[PDB]
Design an enzyme around this catalytic site. Structure first.
Site, PDB file in Angstrom:
ATOM      1  N   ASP A   1      21.069  39.760  57.385  1.00  0.00           N
ATOM      2  CA  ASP A   1      21.366  40.418  58.660  1.00  0.00           C
ATOM      3  C   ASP A   1      20.280  40.665  59.700  1.00  0.00           C
ATOM      4  OD1 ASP A   1      24.112  40.492  58.111  1.00  0.00           O
ATOM      5  OD2 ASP A   1      23.985  42.448  57.134  1.00  0.00           O
ATOM      6  N   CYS A   2      19.171  39.932  59.652  1.00  0.00           N
ATOM      7  CA  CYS A   2      18.123  40.163  60.644  1.00  0.00           C
ATOM      8  C   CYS A   2      18.593  39.843  62.066  1.00  0.00           C
ATOM      9  CB  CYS A   2      16.857  39.370  60.320  1.00  0.00           C
ATOM     10  SG  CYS A   2      15.421  39.998  61.218  1.00  0.00           S
ATOM     11  N   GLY A   3      19.375  38.773  62.207  1.00  0.00           N
ATOM     12  CA  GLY A   3      19.897  38.376  63.509  1.00  0.00           C
ATOM     13  C   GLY A   3      20.803  39.449  64.086  1.00  0.00           C
TER      14      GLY A   3
END
Length: 137
Positions: free
Chosen positions: A12-14
């Site tokens: 989930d970094c984006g």
């Protein structure tokens, strides 16, 4: 002062950096929602995915290839998103909030890092040069 929505799931970094920037402009979107909108998979989010999601959110977007002189431009608009390579992580991103001295103020969704100061040297070593700028249309 610097709002950052941290990630929990490793992919989930984006969604996290997008949620962070959106929050700066007054909009609050969940990671689960942005994960779906950006077509985020096991490997993470592509730059295209971040851009597509941002556009669906009503943001004017632009992706550019830049270098460190970008931070010497006094009219630079913060915050923005950058693609950084960290170890074998080929899909990690930071939010860039500003610059002070020989350091940059960045927002790393990694919950053990979050908002911190990073030397321009260190940042330059990880940054692919890709920067994504968003603005409410």
């Amino acid at each position: 002062h610097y709002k950052l929505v941290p990630q929990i799931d490793t992919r989930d970094c984006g969604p996290a950096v997008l949620a962070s920037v959106a929050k700066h402009y007054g909009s609050n979107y969940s990671i689960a929602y942005l994960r779906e909108l950006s077509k985020t998979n096991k490997q993470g989010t592509t730059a295209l995915g971040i851009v597509e999601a941002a556009k669906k959110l009503g943001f004017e977007t632009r992706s550019i290839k830049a270098d460190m002189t970008l931070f010497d431009y006094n009219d630079l608009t913060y915050p923005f998103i950058v693609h950084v390579i960290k170890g074998k992580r080929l899909q990690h991103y930071y939010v860039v909030y500003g610059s002070q001295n020989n350091q940059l103020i960045i927002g790393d969704p990694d919950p053990s890092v979050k908002v911190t100061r990073m030397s321009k040297e260190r940042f330059q070593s990880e940054w692919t040069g890709l920067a994504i700028f968003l603005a409410p249309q």
